[PDB]
């Protein structure tokens, strides 16, 4: 039946999590390894916008010591 509109696992197989937000710690950690670092965009099949905006948000977050920047910070 009509207008169910974005329940789950529909439009896209993989949910877009955040765009540009960084004040929640958890939204960034959705694409962050146990090494403490971003996974490349080819492997996950993420859509370029959510990624392009996350490139600023993740660098921002790392600079506020919400993330390690460097392997020495593990």
């Amino acid at each position: 039946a009509r207008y169910f509109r974005r329940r789950k696992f529909c439009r896209f197989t993989a949910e877009g999590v955040q765009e540009i937000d960084y004040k929640d710690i958890a939204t960034l950690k959705n694409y962050i390894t146990e090494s403490g670092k971003i996974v490349p965009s080819r492997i996950t099949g993420t859509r370029a916008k959510y990624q392009r905006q996350l490139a600023r948000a993740i660098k921002r977050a790392r600079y506020l010591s919400l993330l390690p920047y460097t392997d020495r910070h593990q």
Binding site: I20, Y22, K23, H73
Partner: protein, 135 residues
């Protein structure tokens, strides 16, 4: 006016400095007919890398609207605060001033992720247990 989501973090032992500073910054905003639409303190959290030393800081979300002329002066202010270790302020585009994305992470912090120690007691008087002069 335009909305600017400033987040800053503070050195534990230096938290005692902030209850006098924060109430002048709020008077400077409302003095320009902007607004405090939340002001959430989150409690103490572990930094990934130290900034001005210590692996721990106490995180405070002001949630300002202020005019464009004023925020350039307040942003310079919050970064060069010594009690503040580092600060970041985000854009007007795709901003919430209701319904907080950190509402659960905040509560979790007070319940579970502080020290529960004397060095984080120092944070809680600059925390949600906030005291400020009336405007």
């Amino acid at each position: 006016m335009r909305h600017y989501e400033i987040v800053f973090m503070v050195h534990p032992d230096q938290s005692e400095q902030v209850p006098g500073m924060i109430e002048r910054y709020t008077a400077a905003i409302t003095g320009a007919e902007g607004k405090i639409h939340r002001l959430e303190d989150w409690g103490r959290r572990q930094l990934a890398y130290p900034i001005n030393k210590l692996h721990k800081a106490h995180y405070v979300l002001m949630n300002v609207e202020a005019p464009q002329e004023v925020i350039d002066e307040l942003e310079t202010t919050f970064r060069f605060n010594d009690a503040v270790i580092r600060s970041m302020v985000m854009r007007t585009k795709h901003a919430v001033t209701e319904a907080s994305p950190m509402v659960k992470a905040k509560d979790e912090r007070r319940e579970r992720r502080d020290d529960f120690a004397n060095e984080t007691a120092d944070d809680a008087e600059a925390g949600d247990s906030e005291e400020e002069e009336e405007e």
